[PDB]
Amino acid sequence: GSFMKTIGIFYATLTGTTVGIVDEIEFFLKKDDFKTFNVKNGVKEIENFENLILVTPTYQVGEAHAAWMNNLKKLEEIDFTGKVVGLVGLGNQFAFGESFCGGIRYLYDIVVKKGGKVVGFTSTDGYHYEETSIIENGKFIGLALDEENQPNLTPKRIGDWITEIKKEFK
Numbered sequence: 001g002s003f004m005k006t007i008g009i010f011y012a013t014l015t016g017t018t019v020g021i022v023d024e025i026e027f028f029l030k031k032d033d034f035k036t037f038n039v040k041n042g043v044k045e046i047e048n049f050e051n052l053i054l055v056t057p058t059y060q061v062g063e064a065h066a067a068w069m070n071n072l073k074k075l076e077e078i079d080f081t082g083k084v085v086g087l088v089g090l091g092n093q094f095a096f097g098e099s100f101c102g103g104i105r106y107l108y109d110i111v112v113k114k115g116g117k118v119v120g121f122t123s124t125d126g127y128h129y130e131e132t133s134i135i136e137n138g139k140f141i142g143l144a145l146d147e148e149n150q151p152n153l154t155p156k157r158i159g160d161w162i163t164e165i166k167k168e169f170k
């Protein structure tokens with residue numbers, strides 16, 4: 001069309017940090033159409049978008065937030081063929097040296113298995129990790145944010161990532 005198809009932004013939060021990240025994403029998409037959803041209210045609307053941004057903090061040794069984890073079977077019922085998905089994780093890379101932003105792995109594996117494309121892999125430069133489960137092809141499988149230790153890097157990390165994924169968006 002004349003403009004990008006609407007972007008569906010789906011997030012969860014326990015203590016509110018992720019809300020702020022979503023607000024930053026929305027600001028960078030100020031002039032583009034988006035709709036935002038908290039997956040505590042379910043995931044069914046993911047079916048309705050071709051362009052998606054899925055956001056989760058990490059808990060429980062590399063899991064996504066419970067509202068995502070509880071919906072993984074419903075998520076896997078969706079046909080992701082033709083969808084273009086960016087993944088955003090929040091975590092603490094120093095306190096969780098083997099599970100930083102691990103929650104996005106659960107989302108990645110479902111999107112790919114159900115026919116979707118994941119875009120916006122990011123460099124591991126400037127991050128610390130002992131082991132990871134969120135690398136493919138030498139890159140992190142999404143945007144990895146650390147508001148506890150690297151909050152000053154978040155705005156540029158998000159802005160650069162949004163610019164990249166928009167190039168693949170429908």
Ligand SMILES: Cc1cc2nc3c(=O)[nH]c(=O)nc-3n(C[C@H](O)[C@H](O)[C@H](O)COP(=O)(O)O)c2cc1C
Nearest residue numbers: 014015016017018057058061062091092096100101
């Ligand atoms: C009990 C607990 C466990 C956590 N487990 C992880 C983890 O495995 N990996 C990670 O990267 N961050 C982990 N974190 C860090 C949180 O994901 C991070 O603080 C995030 O910004 C919280 O987002 P929220 O305020 O939106 O819930 C953990 C935090 C807490 C309190």
